[PDB]
Each structure stands twice: as C-alpha cells, then as structure tokens.
Paper text:
Bacterial cellulosic polymers constitute a prevalent class of biofilm matrix exopolysaccharides that are synthesized by several types of bacterial cellulose secretion (Bcs) systems, which include conserved cyclic diguanylate (c-di-GMP)-dependent cellulose synthase modules together with diverse accessory subunits. Here we present cryo-EM structures of the E. coli Bcs macrocomplex positioning all seven BcsRQABEFG partners and multiple c-di-GMP-binding sites.
We demonstrated previously that contrary to the canonical 1:1 BcsAB assemblies observed in purified samples from R. sphaeroides (Type III Bcs secretion system)23 and G. hansenii (Type I Bcs secretion system), in the assembled E. coli Bcs macrocomplex BcsA associates with a BcsB hexamer whose periplasmic modules of alternating carbohydrate-binding and flavodoxin-like domains (CBD1-FD1-CBD2-FD2) polymerize via a β-sheet complementation mechanism between the FD1n:FD2n+1 domains of adjacent BcsB protomers. The structure of the hexameric periplasmic crown is refined here to 2.35 Å resolution and reveals to near-atomic detail the molecular mechanism of BcsB polymerization, with more than 3300 Å2 interface surface and a free energy gain of −22.5 kcal/mol between each pair of adjacent protomers.
Residue numbers in the entry:
A (entry chain B): 67 to 445, 465 to 741
B (entry chain C): 67 to 445, 465 to 493, 500 to 606, 659 to 741
Write the structure that this text describes.
Amino acid sequence: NGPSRDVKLTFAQIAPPPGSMVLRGINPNGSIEFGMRSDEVVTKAMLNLEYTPSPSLLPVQSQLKVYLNDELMGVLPVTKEQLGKKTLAQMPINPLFITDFNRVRLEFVGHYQDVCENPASTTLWLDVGRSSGLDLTYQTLNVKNDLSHFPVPFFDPRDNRTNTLPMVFAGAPDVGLQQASAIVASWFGSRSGWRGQNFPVLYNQLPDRNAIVFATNDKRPDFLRDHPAVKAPVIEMINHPQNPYVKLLVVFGRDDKDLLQAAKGIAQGNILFRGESVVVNEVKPLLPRKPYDAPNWVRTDRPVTFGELKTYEEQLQSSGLEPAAINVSLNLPPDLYLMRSTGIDMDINYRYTMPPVKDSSRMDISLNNQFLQSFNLSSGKTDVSIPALKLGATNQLRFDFEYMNPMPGGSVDNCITFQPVQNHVVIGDDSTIDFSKYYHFIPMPDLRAFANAGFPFSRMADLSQTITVMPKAPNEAQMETLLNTVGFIGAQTGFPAINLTVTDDGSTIQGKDADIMIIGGIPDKLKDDKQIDLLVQATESWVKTPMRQTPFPGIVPDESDRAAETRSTLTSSGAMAAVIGFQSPYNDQRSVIALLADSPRGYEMLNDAVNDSGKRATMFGSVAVIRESGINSLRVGDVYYVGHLPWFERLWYALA
Amino acid sequence: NGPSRDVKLTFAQIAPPPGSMVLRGINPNGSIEFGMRSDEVVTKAMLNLEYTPSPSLLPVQSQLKVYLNDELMGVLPVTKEQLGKKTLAQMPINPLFITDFNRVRLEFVGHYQDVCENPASTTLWLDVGRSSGLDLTYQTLNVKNDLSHFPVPFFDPRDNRTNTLPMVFAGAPDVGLQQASAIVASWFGSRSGWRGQNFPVLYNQLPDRNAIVFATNDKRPDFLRDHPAVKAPVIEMINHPQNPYVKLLVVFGRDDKDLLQAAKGIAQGNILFRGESVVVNEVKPLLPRKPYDAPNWVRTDRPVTFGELKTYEEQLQSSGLEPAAINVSLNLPPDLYLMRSTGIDMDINYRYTMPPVKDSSRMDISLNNQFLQSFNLSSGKTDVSIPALKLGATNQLRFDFEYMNPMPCITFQPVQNHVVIGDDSTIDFSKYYHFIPMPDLRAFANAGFPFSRMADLSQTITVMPKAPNEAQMETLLNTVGFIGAQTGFPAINLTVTDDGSTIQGKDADIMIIGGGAMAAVIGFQSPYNDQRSVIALLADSPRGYEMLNDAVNDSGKRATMFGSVAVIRESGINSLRVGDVYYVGHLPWFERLWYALA
C-alpha cells in the first residue's frame, strides 16, 4: 500500500565510535541502536555480520547469540571451518519485536578447553567488523490527520536523522511572511536539537515529503486556489493532493500579521493542538525573557545540580563488569569571563561497589577528552576544581570507572571456577557545579561562539534584541539560509525566536540597540566599514591576513598577532562563501554577523556549512572562508569587548 | 592507469640496530603509522612478517593479531612447528579501511600454561625481525583542477618525503622574475619546513611531475605559445599537455611586476584561491615585520605557554598501560645572549594517575635524548632551569612517565594510566638580549639568521649574475626555500639585483651568488654597516653548484658547516675559521661591564 524505503545501517555509523566490536569472555555483550518512526513499520529486517572467531575456540560450544529487545533472534555456532577466519552470516530479524526504540545485542559465549579455563584469558575473543550492518525496509503508514501528535509526522523524535522539513511559499515572501517562517523554523530547530536542521524552500511548488505551507487569502500557492477564505489564522493538517501518504501543515491567515500570530501560536501553544484544524485567537506575552535564560544553557543564578543537566533518566548510572562511562553535557553562556578564575568548583557525590581488597581501581574525571583528576575506589561529597582554561560553550564531562577485577584461580593442582559479579556505579543527582560567581565579558568577534551558541543573538533566547537584514525579494537559496541560520540557533538555545525582527530597508537599523544579522550581502552604508576583514562581491573578493596565526592560542586575544598584515584582492569564477563578524557602527556593545555568498553554489556551500555541526565547529576568529575544500578561519582584526566588568574586578586584577 | 609507487615501511618502536622488536606480556603491541596523500590511493597492501615465537608457548592459544585503523585484518596462530623457529608469514591488508592517517597494529596474545598464569613471565615473548614491514603500492589519481586545495597536489602536508617542486621558466629570468620565483619558493619551503625542499629549474622543458610555470606575455615557454594575452596577473591550474596526472601551476602575467604581484598573492592571499584560475588584483601591505617575529621561533615579547608550542591538540596528553612520551619542540632565535645566566626558567603543571601505593614511579625530562632531571610521582608543579646552548636548531623536550605497575594465583585486568602536561606551563625568553659573534656558518646552516632576522627578508639584498644559469637559479631557490623553512614565513620583501653597484651604502644584509668542482660559502662583515653581514654562495662548475645545493638541503651536511668559510668538494666538507671576529646586537653598557668583570 504505502511507499517502501530500503536503508542499510552499517555498524560504522550506529556503533561505538570505533565502529568495530571485540567481544571477549569478560565483555561478551555489544549492542547497536536504531529507532522507528511513528508513521513507519519495518517489513523486512536482516542483520549481516562479518566476524572472526578466535582460534583455540571449542567449535560447537562457542557460539554467537543475537538479541532484539532482549528476545533471541538466533544463534550462530562457531563451525570448525570458521576458526580464525572471516565469516559472513545473515541472521533474519523478526519485525514483530521492533518498537519505537530497538536494541540489537550480540552475546558471545566462548570456551577454549574442556577443563579448567579462565574467562578472562585474552584467547577468548570474537571481533565483529565495522562492515557489518542491519538491512531494513520501512513502509510508510497513512496516519490520520490529527493535530495531536502535532510535530510527529514532520519532526519525529524517534528519528535520529537530520530533520529535513521543506517550507512552501506562494512566491517571494514579504517581511511578515519571512518573520513567521523564521519563527516556525526556530521552533522546529529547538525541537530537533542535536539531530540537525534543513529547510528546503519551494516557491509555488508541491514537495515530495512532509512540509509546511504558508498561505494568505491573497497570496497562496496554486493547489490552494480553491481553498475558502479565512477570517482568522487557521492551522490545518491536510493530505498531499497527489500522495495520500505525505502530510502538509497549511498555515493559513488573512495576512502577514495573521500568519505571524499563527506562528507564535505554534511556538507557544502547541500543547492545545487537536483535531484536523485549529484557529489561533490570541497569544499574549505576559512576561519577557531575561538574558542568558536559554533552556539548554547552565543557569547562572545559583549552583546547578547534575539532575538538571541530564537529558534522560538513568543517565548518571552505569552497570556491568566494566561499567560504561557516564557523560554530562555542560552548555555555558559563551561570554562567561573565566580568564581569571583559578578553577570552577564542583562537588561530586559518587557511589560505587567497593572491591573486596585494595587495588588500583579508580574513577577518572575527564573534561573534553582530557584527564583532570583520579579518585581511588578503595578509600561522601568530594571537591573537584576544574581549570577554566579549557571550558568552552559546549563541554563534556566523563566519569570513567576503571575496575581491576581480581578473580581467583585456585592452585595448579586444584582449579576454581567463578561467576563474575557485575559492578554498579552512580553519580548522584545532588552533585553541583557553580557558575553563578562569574561575569559576562567576551573578546568579540568570536565566530566560534557564533557557530556554537548563536551568542550575539542568543543572549536573548527569543531574539528580541536581534534584527535580520534580508534582500527585497529573496530567492530560495537566501530564504533557506535565513531559515537554517535561525533553526540552528533555536536548536542551540532550546527556545523559539518569537520576537525576532526581520527588516528589508537596511537603513531602519540606524540608531538601534540591536545585534544585526545580514544574509543577502552587506548594505552600502556598512560596506565601507573599516572593521570588515573580508568582503565578497559577485566575483571579486578581498581578505585581510593577520600577522601571526597561532594554531592553539590562549584565550587572551593577543591583539598584536591579530593585526592585519596585508590586504589581498582576488577575482575568480569559483564558488566561495563566508561568515564575517565585526563591531556595529551604531553601538559599541553590539555586533554584526554577515553570511555572504557569491553564487548559487556558494549559497549551497554556506547552507551545508550552517547545517553541518561538524563543519560549524571548525569556524572561529573573525572571518570564516567556506570553499569546496572546506572551512578556513582567520583571527584577524580589532578586538572589542562586549559586557560589563565591575570596577571591583578591574581594580583587584590591576595589581595581579 | 596512472603511475604507481611502491613503498616499504618498518615498525615504529623497533630497536636500535642490530637489535629487533620483541613483544612481551606488559606491552604486546607494535604499531606502524603512515599518512596518505590526497592524490594517491593504495591498490595493493601486504604485511610481511619475520617473527620467532618463544619455544615455551601454548601453540594455538597464542596468536598474532593484525589491525588496521582498529579493524582486524586477520590472525596468525602459533603452530607447534613454529615454536622457537623463524617464521615468515604474509597478511593482506584491505585498502577499503585506509584513510588520511593510518595505523597498523600488531597485537601479541601469549600463553604458556592452563592455570596459574603470570603475565610478567619471562617465557612470554615474540621476537619480530627488522625485515618485517608493510608493502604498499600507491597509485596517482587525476584530481580535479580546483585551487581550493591549492597546495595539495604540489606540496601535500601528509607526505613525509622531501617536496621536490620543479620550477619552469621561459629563459634566463630577469630580476623581477627571479624575485617572484624566490617568493614562491620561500612560501613553499615555509609550508614544508621540517621536510626537505628542492626546486629543480628547467628553462624550456616540461617536467614529468607537478611544477610551477612562470610566463609573461612577451616571454613564454614553447608549450605555452597558445595562451591568450592576459591583462592582469593570473594563477591557473592546468593539466600537463601530455600527462593528465602531472598538473602544472601557471603564473601568467603582463610583466615582472604582475608576476611579483601574483607571487605575493600566492604567499599571502591563498585563502581566496578557488576555481581553475584566479586573478590577483592588488596585494596591499599594511604593517611591517618586527625583528624575531618568525612564526617558527619562540616569542621574545612575553612568556610562552606550552599551548602555543603545540602542533596538534592532545599532544601534551598520553594514555595507556605504559603511556608514551610527550614531546614539545622549541625553536629559538640564534642570537640570544646566554653567557650570563645559568639557564632558562620553566614552570610545569602536570597531572597524572596516582599509583595505589608509593613506588619508584617517576617522570623523566629529556632534552635532545639527553637526560636532564627525574621527579617522583607521589603526593603537581615543577620549576626547572634549562641551560641554553642549542640556539638555532630545533630542540625536543621529552617527558617520560614510567610506571612500576605493581602486582596486587590471581588474574587481574591492568588499569591504564593518564598523564597530562598543562597548557598553562610557561617557558620564558622575553627578558633576554640578542648577542653572538656573527661570522658563524652554524647560524646560517641552522636558521639563515643574518637574513632570517627579518622573516620577510626586508633587510636583505641578493646579488645574482646577469643571465643566470639553471644551477644559478636553483641555488637561489634552494637557499630562499631553506630560509623560509627555518622562518615559517615567505620572503615577500626580498630584493634581488643584477649589478653590484646598488648595494653600496645600504643598511641591509647581502647574499651573493657567483663563481675538481669547488663550492665555497664565505661570510664576513659588511663594509657599509658594522652590524650587517655578507654571505657568499660561490661555485665554479655546474657540478659545484649541484653539490652546494646538496649540502644546503642535506641536514647532515649542514651540521658539518661552521666557522667563516666552508669549502665543498667531492672528498667532503671542510670549514676553517678565518678572518676577524665581530659582534652584532644591542648589549647595554652595564651588562657589558658585568660580563667583562665576571
């Protein structure tokens, strides 16, 4: 009935970062994870395995077991012909046991002797290659047009892929339509988060996937011509006119103000979505946002507990003979002034299963893949000071419990066989880390801060102090750039950009206390700015190169190194794009971030760089050149500080 | 369909000859690391091994495991016929798992008993001969003509070999063409610093490899007498007319001024390179270079943190059962005055995994394989003083963390250890002075110091013959590339001349190139300025020029150059200190008085 879709899930993508897995007698389990959308059903599942059982393995006694959601799918005994050789195995997977979240676990049973044997012998291994995969077939279901499960058909949280959500307009959008689409894109990005954002833009065209359609009583796409006129903003979930398995979210309104009201209702009142059509009556902003109040950032009004940092329950606990590391994500306001702090105070309350005798078992605390401190297990609330030099906008805290498991072996005459006992390790939810004793002071421009948190615009999570400058009649590429650059900011903040202001004149921003975002090229007034270190015309580009580009500089800007050495102007037909940042001429505390492209291919490259988190993480400094090869960043230009340092700190640190 | 290249690698750790690599229970791992050029793929790979397993090993329980990027390529179980005898075993390597950086690991699983096994038993060993290695067959690809990867096909950073980059002209170059070629060679040497640099020169002959072609409207090579006339300096990436795998970079311009502008654009504005052709419109300098601002050298204006000495992240940390040594490279300007103070102060912050009980675990600090001082790991700050007499050449600072790994029969899984050297560790060089007697060829052969005091070679004039030969251009390109490699910066402001009358009465250093085979390097004081100097690169025969270039590009030969005059002949390299001795610098009066009194 519904359309089908064949996917191959290679172990290198859905496995631990190495991709491969060596199953031993002491660590016999290894799992892969995959989810299923609420509008899809698996009709055919097959697990292809490429593994090499160790020689010296007893053939029929050594086996490899495959589990799906703790249900046995089959067993692969190690035939004598397979000892020490690469083997190809096809294990069918029953679709009746596939649910929203699915774990496929490989269990290895291994024996090398008919007599006394050591489970931890290093000769009992079976490594599964990363070329192994899980072939799946998905069939789309005809879900009913109910506005409950509102995001589900468009963004499904059970799907870990990039949320590709097309947006359909009648034509070139006006300022109000651009603002409403930006609000919707920001909300969808905040919902999708780490999965990624992608908003293809179609003008008067029906797409082949689930999409959002913006319509007005006057300006509407072709397929909505027969739709009756509306008296209020109406949100309808209708079927695709040609594909009943494709859903359309039609945001209909009398005009741009009605569409804006509907977008705000989507952003702030989606909990009341029901039926097949909803009319938005009024959204009342009772309370404004405060600086640095993004839901995805660490609160700075009081010490934050580890419970408020975990994203899912049972995250701060691990079990097993060798328990997996515990990871806590620390997201901070990018302008936290930590250049002077000796260290950040962190009180850790950790519980573990004590080994019977004193050994070298320990718990290792690692920040951003760097070892910080170690605590011996054979020893309440421990005080740990983490240096602030390596604290960025996005941080990862890892707690590794290295266990030396002393298992007896008896004597030479008489052996003993033991059953290993698993260990339990817990990091308490009462553990706290304090970030409330620091000020907001950053050496702008910081394209790293931009690409990591949208800082100049995410200082207010609703983007109320941000103005976006767009061309008069933007095309699909420019609208895609705006939607993607708003969606990724929404993803980092966790809050939709309800109060974002989009302008077109380019001169109304004069004398306004707002950070500026430029998409369709720098206006004439700001084009002659002396702080711009990179400008891209249709085919002519010039850049300013710093005196010294240290690969790993300290947090101190070192303005002597950042001084521009030479300015080189080059012209070519090859595509390029750039993101630049400079001080606003109208306010010393404000900033301007401009996304520049010279061609459709340049816009494609810029959009890909914005969408890809890995490509974004490579942006730093003041200018980020995007080419076919990749992204190259320069730390060039003047340094201006945004924030307020009280005179207490300045006087205290004047005398060291 | 392209050319193929065969290489043979050898295990990294191995041992000094005539030793061999032995894998034991403590660390049964042997690794081979190699990088891949972006224009090459591996067509056939194979690991040849010559190993002698211990005669007291359980045969089939003991195995050899080969990994490639943490992917098992195969296993080599020990056989009863192989116990105590030399065994030759081959293991194919799948090219599908080869990436930019590759690691081939040999893992040893050893067993001598069924119960009560001691991992530290002396009977668990596997000797691997030095003849064991990896046989690879690279194949050259036809890469796209994109300047976004501008240096990739000419100088590949992932290539560890010497970068041989032929330079093609149209004839005897003029002064402007010489200057532009020198700028380009300086930039390429700067990009390929610690690896060798060689720039063969051809006058009207296309080469068989990647090359840089300099052409003007009036003067073109024979194969370029079809390109339309250009109205601006143009840099173009084109295929070789008879070999689509060779690739050429064509620097086309109206005249020598346009070629110079294109060279400066290559040196500075390479971040804007895109497409198959770029047009350099204007390279406008804004700021000059201060002395001793070469990026390769340590800062002399403020204390240097260890983070700024890092070439890659995670260099200062190491993990494992026995963590590997941590190496920091220090390049010092070869004029610091260290005849007054005892040494150089160091502040070191290091964190480590504490052993469960106090033992003889220690950290060793080594300077150029010379043991300096050991510290004990038990409780982490540390203040050290380093004597400084290795100016110019690169210095390796090694931190070796040796753990005793005490034994708690009973079988246990060993726990890995983490050692970290802080990025806030500080070494100081800002509060010193610049003073050494200039007429030393060691300073030249190590850093190009008289000319490298300014990275851009602003205060340097080069004198060349009227109609230079291929060898006469090659020596200039080689020396400018060597200076660029030592500095880390292109020589954009280098001045070349054809007649010696311009250098009269100029406050700038002079580098003269002129004339069985004899090659001589002469250094003496500049007549027109007491603080300047002149280094002459003289050679009579073309063979003499060739051996001079070989000496200047060979590190071992450069290490045998000292004094004021060096003479290069087929019998060897001889250098005798002749002439007077004078000093350069700005030593204060009271410091001079204190030094004289001391």
